[PDB]
């Protein structure tokens, strides 16, 4: 939601750490709720306990992506000491992609997820930094 | 210019309202008279470009390439028989008229003031070429070739439209002069980086550069001779033409942001000249030759010297002629023996005796023959890049060594040493083939005499 993404972008990046990781786990909980809701809505799990297992798997993967991504975000920003580069989040997106691939227990999914999640996280910080408007103007 | 467009319109119903066994002479004669009236264009002088009918203007970036298109049309119109003479009347007339409409969108592309008009006629150049290669490819992966072709060229060239529209409504109009005379230098924030990377990435797709190049060789080797020649020469040199136009903006950042494409281009040049050292399938070597030359062109456009631009446009014109001719020789050998591989058709010095003269002449123009236009282009590119940096000359000379090596391999392996003496279907060479050899290698030698016509507008 607007509230938790605003909590995530409230903190300077910057070193006010592990609030970033908790907000990213909230991102993971929301994403897992979305995917799990549609997945149990469009499967007929047969039976409900296996549906609980599927929902738990998706939420655990999304929360793990959020947690690992927030940790590497904060750590890379503390080490490189430059709170304006997108390259630290490039490294963060690749790390999140590799851990997604490892929890799905593969190699190629992990490498392609590294590449695409890194480039998209770079685009996220790059647009938040230079200034690209969220979802509308809506003016002309 | 509109007097050069409107008879190409009226040349289209020629093939329709001419009866059978009479269309051929009509199309040949009339497109050659259009080629005379085309060469009548050359009025360009001094201070300005010649600008009229407000959409239209001619530089000397556009005059020689436009004459190249309006001269390479009837050559191709003659070139593409013996493989569809036995096809039907309807598909024959449709093939010829599709080529003519391809020419019309090409000339519309080359005389484009407004860059949105340029982009529309750019993908208008795209759309018939797919129909040509996919309907008359005469192999079995031509389908996949056309599919890869269109998705690469579109998806690379698609966000270029968005960037040009952004230019259109953040500055004003897109006259090329009012793109010039008004261009403010744009600083190095990240949005300027993306806009430059968008435009340059679209044309990097089109040239190709090294990382996006398997687009081309399947589309070359699985095409008819008409689509192969128009594809290679006119389309790749059109991509270079468009880059020469659009580079006038975003000057004070492309120094900072145009390093890594030089490294990709040079290392791809060496790897491309090495991959065409060891392949079979004679048709593919000329495609990889084209990729080598276009990588050198991309180096020439990323540096910004007038020496570099003169060498760039000369390299474009010369390799268009050379690679188109050598495609035609490859087609002649394949119509002699229905193989498409290389090592089966050895020999051919003895039989088809003066075919050897044209293999020699085409391969030496590929060699950088010592007064040739190819040598002039490569030489000024090497001079300008040495002024760019004093260390790049190793890759240039190693390119020269390997380029000479695969050219000579193509010469002395396909056409040297021993007829394989189990063949007995190769005829003597027809007059049409020698006519096409002559129609390729007269303008290259005439331009070797007086070349100051075709060098760039930075003269």
């Amino acid at each position: 939601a607007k509230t938790l993404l605003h909590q995530y972008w409230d903190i300077p990046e910057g070193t006010e750490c592990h609030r970033k990781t908790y907000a990213a786990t909230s991102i993971g909980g929301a994403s897992g709720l979305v995917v799990s809701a549609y997945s149990v809505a469009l499967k007929t799990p047969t039976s409900f306990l296996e549906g609980v297992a599927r929902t738990g798997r998706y939420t655990f993967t999304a929360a793990a992506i959020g947690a690992i991504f927030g940790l590497t975000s904060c750590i890379s920003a503390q080490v490189r000491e430059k709170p304006d580069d997108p390259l630290n989040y490039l490294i963060g997106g690749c790390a999140g992609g590799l851990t997604l691939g490892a929890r799905t227990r593969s190699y190629g999914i992990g490498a392609a997820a590294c590449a695409y999640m890194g480039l998209t996280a770079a685009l996220v910080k790059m647009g938040q930094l230079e200034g690209w408007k969220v979802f509308a103007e809506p003016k002309v | 210019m509109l007097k050069y467009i409107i008879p190409t319109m009226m040349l289209m119903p020629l093939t329709w309202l001419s009866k059978n066994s009479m269309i051929w002479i009509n199309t040949t004669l009339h497109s050659l008279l259009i080629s005379l009236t085309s060469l009548l264009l050359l009025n360009q002088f001094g201070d300005n470009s010649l600008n009229f009918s407000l959409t239209f203007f001619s530089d000397s970036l556009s005059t020689p390439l436009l004459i190249l298109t309006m001269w390479l049309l009837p050559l191709m119109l003659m070139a593409s028989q013996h493989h569809l003479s036995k096809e039907n009347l309807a598909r024959k007339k449709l093939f010829i008229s599709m080529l003519i409409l391809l020419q019309l969108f090409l000339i519309m592309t080359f005389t484009a003031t407004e860059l949105i008009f340029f982009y529309i006629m750019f993908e208008a150049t795209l759309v018939p070429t797919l129909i040509i290669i996919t309907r008359w490819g005469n192999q079995t992966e031509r389908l996949n070739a056309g599919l890869y072709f269109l998705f690469y060229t579109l998806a690379g060239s698609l966000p270029l439209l968005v960037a040009l529209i952004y230019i259109q409504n953040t500055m004003g109009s897109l006259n090329f002069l009012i793109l010039q005379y008004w261009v403010q230098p744009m600083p190095n924030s990240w949005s300027n980086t993306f806009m430059w990377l968008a435009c340059m990435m679209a044309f990097m797709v089109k040239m190709p550069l090294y990382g996006l190049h398997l687009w081309l060789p399947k589309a070359h080797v699985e095409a008819p001779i008409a689509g192969s020649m128009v594809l290679a020469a006119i389309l790749l040199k059109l991509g270079g033409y468009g880059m020469m136009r659009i580079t006038l903006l975003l000057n004070p950042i492309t120094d900072f942001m145009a390093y890594p494409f030089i490294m990709l281009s040079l290392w791809g040049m060496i790897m491309t000249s090495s991959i065409c050292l060891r392949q079979t399938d004679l048709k593919s070597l000329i495609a990889y030759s084209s990729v080598s030359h276009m990588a050198l062109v991309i180096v020439a456009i990323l540096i910004q010297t007038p020496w570099s631009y003169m060498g760039a446009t000369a390299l474009m014109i010369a390799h268009g002629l050379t690679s188109s001719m050598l495609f035609c020789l490859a087609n002649s050998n394949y119509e002699r023996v229905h193989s498409r591989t290389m090592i089966l058709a050895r020999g051919l010095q003895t039989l088809l005796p003066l075919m050897a003269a044209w293999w020699l002449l085409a391969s030496l123009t590929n060699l950088a023959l010592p007064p040739s236009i190819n040598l002039i282009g490569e030489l000024f590119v090497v001079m300008s890049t040495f002024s760019w940096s004093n260390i790049t000359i190793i890759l240039m000379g190693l390119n020269m060594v390997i380029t000479a090596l695969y050219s000579l391999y193509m010469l002395i392996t396909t056409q040297r040493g021993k007829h394989t003496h189990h063949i007995n279907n190769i005829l003597p060479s027809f007059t049409r083939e020698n006519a096409l050899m002559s129609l390729h290698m007269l303008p290259l030698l005439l331009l070797s005499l007086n070349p100051k016509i075709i060098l760039g507008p930075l003269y």
Binding site: - | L17, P185, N251, P252, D255, Q304, W388
Partner: protein, 119 residues
């Protein structure tokens, strides 16, 4: 861009469009429309198995007339539309000039540019 005081409905050409000149005879856009009508009749011959370039000449004449007529009235509507757009724009220009500044035409003796040589 909605009304613009439509009172006075869609009104395919209003009363005010009679102050601008109509498109001329043999204007090129209506000539394009006529050629497209000709091509429409030719492909109409092509759908059925009647021979093309003959046996449909009255249908050629009908399709060319229909398209040229309709495109003529559409061009009249287009000229009305662009005239009223410029009239609205310049009326609001002349409304409050003090909020649209006319900037100073500085000569290049004083406009400085950061140079950054291209090597």
């Amino acid at each position: 861009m909605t009304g613009r005081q439509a009172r006075a409905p869609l009104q395919f050409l209003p009363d005010e469009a009679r102050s601008l000149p109509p498109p001329k005879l043999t204007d090129p856009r209506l000539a394009y429309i006529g050629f497209l009508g000709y091509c429409s009749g030719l492909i109409d011959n092509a759908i059925r198995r009647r021979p093309v370039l003959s046996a449909g000449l009255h249908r050629q004449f009908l399709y060319i007339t229909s398209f040229v007529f309709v495109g003529y009235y559409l061009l009249k509507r287009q000229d009305y539309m662009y005239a009223v757009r410029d009239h609205d724009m310049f009326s609001y220009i002349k409304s409050h000039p003090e909020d649209f500044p006319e900037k100073d035409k500085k000569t290049y003796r004083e406009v400085f540019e950061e140079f950054h040589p291209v090597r």
